Amino acid sequence: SNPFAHLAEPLDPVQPGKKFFNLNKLEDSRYGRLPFSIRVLLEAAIRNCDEFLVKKQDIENILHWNVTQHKNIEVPFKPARVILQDFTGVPAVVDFAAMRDAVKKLGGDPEKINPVCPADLVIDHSIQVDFNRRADSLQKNQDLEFERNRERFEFLKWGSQAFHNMRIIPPGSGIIHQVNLEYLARVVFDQDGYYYPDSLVGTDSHTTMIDGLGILGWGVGGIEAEAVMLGQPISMVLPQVIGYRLMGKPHPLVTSTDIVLTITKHLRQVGVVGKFVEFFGPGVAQLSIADRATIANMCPEYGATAAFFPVDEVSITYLVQTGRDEEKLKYIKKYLQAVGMFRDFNDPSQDPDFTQVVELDLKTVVPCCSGPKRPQDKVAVSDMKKDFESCLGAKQGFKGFQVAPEHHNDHKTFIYDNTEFTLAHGSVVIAAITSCTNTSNPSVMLGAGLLAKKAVDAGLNVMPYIKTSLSPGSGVVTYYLQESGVMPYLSQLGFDVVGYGCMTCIGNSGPLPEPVVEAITQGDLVAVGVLSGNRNFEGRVHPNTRANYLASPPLVIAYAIAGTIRIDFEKEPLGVNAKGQQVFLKDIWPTRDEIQAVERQYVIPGMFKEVYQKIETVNESWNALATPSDKLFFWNSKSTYIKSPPFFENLTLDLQPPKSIVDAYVLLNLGDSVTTDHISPAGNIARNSPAARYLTNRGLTPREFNSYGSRRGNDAVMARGTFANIRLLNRFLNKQAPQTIHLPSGEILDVFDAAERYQQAGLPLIVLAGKEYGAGSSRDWAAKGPFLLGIKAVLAESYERIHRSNLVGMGVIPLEYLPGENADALGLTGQERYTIIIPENLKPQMKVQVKLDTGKTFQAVMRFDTDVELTYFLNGGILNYMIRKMAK
Numbered sequence: 001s002n003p004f005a006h007l008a009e010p011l012d013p014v015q016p017g018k019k020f021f022n023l024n025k026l027e028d029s030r031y032g033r034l035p036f037s038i039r040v041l042l043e044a045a046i047r048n049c050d051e052f053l054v055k056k057q058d059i060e061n062i063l064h065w066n067v068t069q070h071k072n073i074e075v076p077f078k079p080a081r082v083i084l085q086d087f088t089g090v091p092a093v094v095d096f097a098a099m100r101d102a103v104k105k106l107g108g109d110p111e112k113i114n115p116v117c118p119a120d121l122v123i124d125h126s127i128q129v130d131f132n133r134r135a136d137s138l139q140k141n142q143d144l145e146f147e148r149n150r151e152r153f154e155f156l157k158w159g160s161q162a163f164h165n166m167r168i169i170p171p172g173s174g175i176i177h178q179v180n181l182e183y184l185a186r187v188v189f190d191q192d193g194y195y196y197p198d199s200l201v202g203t204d205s206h207t208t209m210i211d212g213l214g215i216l217g218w219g220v221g222g223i224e225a226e227a228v229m230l231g232q233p234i235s236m237v238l239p240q241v242i243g244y245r246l247m248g249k250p251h252p253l254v255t256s257t258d259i260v261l262t263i264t265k266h267l268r269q270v271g272v273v274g275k276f277v278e279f280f281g282p283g284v285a286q287l288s289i290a291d292r293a294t295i296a297n298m299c300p301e302y303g304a305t306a307a308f309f310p311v312d313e314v315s316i317t318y319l320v321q322t323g324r325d326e327e328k329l330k331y332i333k334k335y336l337q338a339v340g341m342f343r344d345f346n347d348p349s350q351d352p353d354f355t356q357v358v359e360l361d362l363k364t365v366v367p368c369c370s371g372p373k374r375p376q377d378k379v380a381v382s383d384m385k386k387d388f389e390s391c392l393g394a395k396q397g398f399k400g401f402q403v404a405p406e407h408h409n410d411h412k413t414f415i416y417d418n419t420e421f422t423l424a425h426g427s428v429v430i431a432a433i434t435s436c437t438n439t440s441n442p443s444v445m446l447g448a449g450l451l452a453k454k455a456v457d458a459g460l461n462v463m464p465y466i467k468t469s470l471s472p473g474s475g476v477v478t479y480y481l482q483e484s485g486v487m488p489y490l491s492q493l494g495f496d497v498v499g500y501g502c503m504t505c506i507g508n509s510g511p512l513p514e515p516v517v518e519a520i521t522q523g524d525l526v527a528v529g530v531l532s533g534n535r536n537f538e539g540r541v542h543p544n545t546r547a548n549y550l551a552s553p554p555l556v557i558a559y560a561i562a563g564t565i566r567i568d569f570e571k572e573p574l575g576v577n578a579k580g581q582q583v584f585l586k587d588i589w590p591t592r593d594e595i596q597a598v599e600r601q602y603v604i605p606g607m608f609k610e611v612y613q614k615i616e617t618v619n620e621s622w623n624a625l626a627t628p629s630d631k632l633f634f635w636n637s638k639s640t641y642i643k644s645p646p647f648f649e650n651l652t653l654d655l656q657p658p659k660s661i662v663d664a665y666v667l668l669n670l671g672d673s674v675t676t677d678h679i680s681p682a683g684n685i686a687r688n689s690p691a692a693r694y695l696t697n698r699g700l701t702p703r704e705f706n707s708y709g710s711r712r713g714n715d716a717v718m719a720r721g722t723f724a725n726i727r728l729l730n731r732f733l734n735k736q737a738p739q740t741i742h743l744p745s746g747e748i749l750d751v752f753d754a755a756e757r758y759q760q761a762g763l764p765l766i767v768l769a770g771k772e773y774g775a776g777s778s779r780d781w782a783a784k785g786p787f788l789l790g791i792k793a794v795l796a797e798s799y800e801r802i803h804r805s806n807l808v809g810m811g812v813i814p815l816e817y818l819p820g821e822n823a824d825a826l827g828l829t830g831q832e833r834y835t836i837i838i839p840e841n842l843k844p845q846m847k848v849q850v851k852l853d854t855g856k857t858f859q860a861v862m863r864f865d866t867d868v869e870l871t872y873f874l875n876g877g878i879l880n881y882m883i884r885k886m887a888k
């Protein structure tokens with residue numbers, strides 16, 4: 001039974017059948033000092049205590065957090081639900097279908113492969129900015145989306161019928177996280193007579209955006225989410241919690257976006273990988289839910305697992321504003337208050353006992369952007385011109401473009417729409433109001449509109465060759481931009497709505513005008529994209545922009561109007577007004593107070609009701625998609641999108657022990673901050689690549705390639721796409737190239753081709769890497785890929801959280817250098833042959849010996865961090881383990 005059953009009591013004696021586990025009846029003073037993020041873990045353990053998956057000791061360990069956070073203690077966590085998008089959602093449903101095949105093969109019941117919690121999937125990663133700056137651009141983009149992705153859509157739609165508990169939010173509805181915040185989020189569950197906190201994992205690294213609403217959620221690989229949907233607890237080392245104390249007031253010109261870029265930079269410096277961050281202090285109460293969500297969104301960019309803002313009265317106000325049901329609201333606040341999970345940030349006596357506290361005085365926040373090449377590279381708006389011009393001549397890097405000083409004032413004329421324009425270094429060519437990060441925030445969306453109106457009335461324009469776009473994460477945005485009268489002015493500046501999906505945020509940015517591309521390449525220009533996103537890594541916004549700056553939506557507009565980031569907005573006007581002459585940014589910038597009025601006036605629950613009323617059913621094209629009635633997927637050999645994966649080939653019920661990796665070759669020698677984009681690119685498929693050759697062989701032209709993310713249900717493409725990022729910096733080649741050296745022959749080959757040779761010869765492979773290996777996107781293809789290339793281990797200085805978990809899930813060993821040790825320090829070339837000794841008895845975090853064919857030996861930490869992770873390793877993977885459990 002549940003040992004804590006006595007804690008269950010009615011919330012309200014008027015409705016005696018609706019109960020909750022009352023953590024206050026624990027009568028334990030440790031509870032009242034817990035970070036509110038830890039209280040969520042505690043509750044989930046108590047309600048789920050069976051003495052099997054979740055044990056009474058587990059509850060004590062979580063309660064004893066203040067002590068046990070230092071004792072490397074694993075705990076279970078069963079979240080309330082799972083959220084997915086289509087890029088990671090396709091391979092997830094392929095995994096499920098493949099697991100059903102495997103379970104049937106072994107004589108099990110394939111209906112056991114079925115989500116036992118709610119799964120919501122939002123289709124947002126497929127639409128691209130094929131067209132912009134026109135009224136019909138949205139329809140034209142929506143049409144191409146469906147035309148390009150029909151098979152994937154029919155497949156997801158079948159998935160939503162063939163597996164229990166799956167709701168799909170169709171194309172043209174907005175973006176996962178914004179839809180989560182405005183519609184999908186429960187805050188408090190009311191299931192089978194028990195209230196409990198909403199919590200989740202999502203197959204997207206920015207799932208942490210939900211934490212702004214006091215919902216404990218974070219990103220995970222699909223394989224981890226798959227296990228969770230099947231009832232497997234998350235296994236984690238009980239985390240330390242950094243208290244981020246906010247104080248002061250932001251200046252009225254400062255935006256949510258300025259604040260998050262400031263905090264991102266701040267927390268990467270601090271180092272919070274493997275930890276929760278939990279916000280508190282007098283400064284939190286002034287932040288709206290949208291503001292808190294902006295900050296929480298960027299959790300993976302600063303490294304943490306969670307960035308938590310507990311539920312307070314501001315959260316409740318957001319729920320009433322977004323039109324949540326009256327009945328539900330009643331028990332959300334009432335439940336949180338009764339259980340001790342309801343916050344008042346204005347009461348220091350209620351502040352938890354965090355591991356340590358770090359501080360931000362919001363008055364120190366200045367208007368800012370981040371770039372040109374990393375989310376943590378904060379640049380004051382006041383210093384944008386200076387910093388870029390410094391970048392022009394600096395050695396090629398995150399803060400260098402390496403342009404000879406003589407050319408810093410280069411410019412190229414070009415003709416666009418029979419008018420001559422001049423492009424130069426720092427010219428803005430992409431200006432996209434994009435990303436759930438910011439479009440969920442009416443302060444910056446209306447800010448952007450009010451700036452647009454001011455500018456238009458002031459007689460300002462955006463040059464017509466500039467690829468401006470507006471890509472909202474829900475239709476509520478457009479609705480209030482129209483009601484408020486600001487949308488026509490956005491339209492005139494070139495910010496018509498182009499789609500309701502990720503779009504430019506994810507690199508789905510579409511073509512630049514031919515004459516603009518010409519000038520850029522012919523002139524050797526550093527052309528600039530400015531976007532309200534959370535990621536700006538070289539090449540991931542557009543192939544032709546060497547500089548990308550994250551900035552608030554109104555700044556996106558400001559740089560569009562100015563047409564360059566090499567501008568001192570204080571010193572230089574934007575243009576000349578036909579009457580009062582000089583028009584400066586200051587004159588057109590809306591104040592916090594002018595924004596708050598329009599927001600208070602135009603963002604009412606009725607709009608949310610209206611937008612979301614028909615969300616699941618309105619898409620006639622979706623509704624039209626025919627699906628088979630099958631429960632077991634009819635794999636089609638003709639498909640280039642959907643393919644039965646080899647993962648479970650010849651799977652046996654019984655386990656055989658792990659053997660050492662013997663005389664492994666190093667497939668790639670990598671450096672620092674290798675992103676999952678480098679490991680498993682998701683955008684354009686290059687004409688000179690293994691994946692292009694495969695698709696060509698199958699009779700497709702480049703225009704039919706689609707993106708890598710779109711091909712994730714086809715392991716044949718995805719293996720070929722592994723380490724195929726054209727900006728991979730393999731230290732074997734000392735240059736950017738998606739290649740490596742096949743050492744036996746000395747030949748330089750595309751990475752997949754080189755791996756084939758090694759695999760044909762029966763040779764094991766490893767990867768050497770530096771710090772922060774696997775940063776960024778949650779994509780488990782950055783683990784499945786290497787697994788299919790024959791990679792048995794990685795040896796790195798440090799790992800990012802989601803990536804490490806995906807490696808473990810695929811049975812690949814994540815090895816870590818000992819402190820003060822790395823490739824240079826050990827004198828490794830990567831051209832040696834590597835023996836990793838696996839002992840008969842394994843322990844989490846154990847050190848193993850690595851032996852080289854040269855005689856050199858050293859030690860590495862084996863980063864299986866919990867007993868459960870070790871069982872995954874012994875099983876050859878997390879889904880292997882789950883098939884075995886379900887087959888018997």
Ligand code: SF4
Pocket residue numbers: 124175176177204206434435436437501502503505506533534
């Ligand atoms: S790619 Fe951008 S818009 Fe899409 S879910 Fe991620 S953060 Fe949001």
